[PDB]
């Protein structure tokens, strides 16, 4: 009986733990910090709190790894400091973004076996793990994290590549947008600690209005929608329509001067790229996942918007699990725990025999 590890590499946060647990043992920022002017490097929370003397780097952009040296550093830290295991003793399941470049898949594989000497590993698509965590083999996952949002149609366990769509707007952009509109109200948040406050404000008081217009109307006429927020010292700020104006950007990217369509239209578009025969199953299984889908009211709004786009006869079902922030990781925990996982992973032997390219035949 061997213990498998599960690592969900996100653009903003990394989630790591042991297969079989119902939640990641460690959640920390995806950052590598190094002496800006002159331990040699830090990762995660420590890098973040020592930002005063370190220059921070984020190796994962839009879900894709853009710096392999820094990613290796993150994994090294994950194994030895966060999980406190020797990687050579554990099969490792890693997650990847939809449409992850072929070269990256091989690089990930090479690093695990050659650098970390893992006895076995596997790469699963994040969105698919999330669907499995919801107990379904068919549906369309709307995955929105920190750096990017994806709409991934999946049929009988397999994503449909040609229909996957991407929206380059996610949590990070909403946090930045909140920073800006909050200034119109006079509040200037520009430092890192201030951005943290803004992120907290977004996570704590923001929400998606069922009907934006009507909500603005409401906000402009009475003080019903305002909320108070206590800052780290003691100052108290008053937040108004910014609470729903912030996440509204997900549905109106133009708020950020983006030309692309909102999340609801992207979901509808992905569904329309799929065979007519399976669209019913997608409309009836829209699964939301990722930290950015955590805004209260998003399910209702997605339901409303999708209903407006689909024929009135089509049954629309938005599934928003309370644990969606970690759906991907949980999905991985379950998959890696199956009595059948054993055979699906790439073993060291196989890697030695075929090399990195083996990932294209064993993980699809």
């Amino acid at each position: 009986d061997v213990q498998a590890l599960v690592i969900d590499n996100g653009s903003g946060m990394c989630k790591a733990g042991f297969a079989g647990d119902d939640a990641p043992r460690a959640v920390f920022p995806s950052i590598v910090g190094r002496p800006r002017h002159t331990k040699d490097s830090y990762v995660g929370d420590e890098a973040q709190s020592k930002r005063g003397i370190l220059t921070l780097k984020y190796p994962i952009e839009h879900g894709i790894v853009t710096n392999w040296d820094d990613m290796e550093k993150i994994w090294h830290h994950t194994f030895y400091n966060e999980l406190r295991v020797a990687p050579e003793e554990h099969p490792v399941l890693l997650t990847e973004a939809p449409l992850n470049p072929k070269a990256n898949r091989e690089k990930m594989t090479q690093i695990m076996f050659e650098t970390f000497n893992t006895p076995a590993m596997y790469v699963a698509i994040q969105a698919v793990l999330s669907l499995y965590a919801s107990g379904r083999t068919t549906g369309i996952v709307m995955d929105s994290g920190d750096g990017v949002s994806h709409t991934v149609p999946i049929y009988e366990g397999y994503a449909l590549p040609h229909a996957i769509l991407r929206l380059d707007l996610a949590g990070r952009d909403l946090t930045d947008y909140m920073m800006k509109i909050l200034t119109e109200r006079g509040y200037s948040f520009t430092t890192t600690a201030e951005r943290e406050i803004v992120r907290d404000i977004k996570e704590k008081l923001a929400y998606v209005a069922l009907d934006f217009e009507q909500e603005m109307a409401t906000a402009a006429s009475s003080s019903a929608l305002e909320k108070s927020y206590e800052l780290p010292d003691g100052q108290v700020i008053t937040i108004g329509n910014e609470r729903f104006r912030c996440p509204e950007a997900l549905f109106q990217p133009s708020f950020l001067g983006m030309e692309s369509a909102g999340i609801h239209e992207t979901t509808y578009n992905s569904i329309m790229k799929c065979d007519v025969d399976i669209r019913k199953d997608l409309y009836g299984n829209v699964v939301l996942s990722g930290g950015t889908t955590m805004f209260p009211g998003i399910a209702d709004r997605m339901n409303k918007e999708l209903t407006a786009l689909a024929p009135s006869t089509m049954k629309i079902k938005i599934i928003a699990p309370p644990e969606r922030k970690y759906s991907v990781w949980i999905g991985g925990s379950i998959l890696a725990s199956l009595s059948t996982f054993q055979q699906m992973w790439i073993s060291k032997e196989e890697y030695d025999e075929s090399g990195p390219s083996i990932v294209h035949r064993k993980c699809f």
Partner: protein, 123 residues
């Protein structure tokens, strides 16, 4: 992936039912077919005999109202794996307690029953 139970899967016409039990696919005693624990998740394979002698398959994963996330998730994954094992010849059906398809319900001559309880989660 060739699991012992997969070797037995869809060999001949009939119905086969397995219950998810701590990340594994466990066969349900034939005498108990139709008695579903609402706190559990199951996988059902209905094999039908075809003209050409080949079998037709319908894979149903049944989800009890109180089944834990690991059980419903494992039910879904095992379903994809069995289908792959059967050369992608199975149509998969998600069946939720109290919302089962006419087809699924029709597999049980005497009508399927629900009983409270089940095996503990594997988490």
């Amino acid at each position: 992936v060739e699991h012992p139970e997969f070797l037995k899967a869809g060999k001949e016409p009939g119905l086969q039912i397995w219950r998810v039990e701590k990340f594994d696919l466990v066969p349900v005693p034939t005498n108990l077919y139709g008695d579903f624990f609402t706190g559990d998740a199951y996988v059902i394979l209905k094999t039908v005999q075809l003209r050409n002698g080949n079998l037709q398959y319908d894979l149903h994963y049944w989800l009890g109202n109180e089944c834990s996330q690991d059980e419903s998730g494992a039910a879904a994954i095992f379903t994809v794996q069995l289908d792959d094992y059967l050369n992608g010849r199975a149509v998969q059906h998600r069946e939720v307690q109290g919302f089962e398809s006419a087809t699924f319900l029709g597999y049980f001559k005497s009508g399927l029953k629900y009983k409270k309880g089940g095996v503990a989660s594997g988490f």
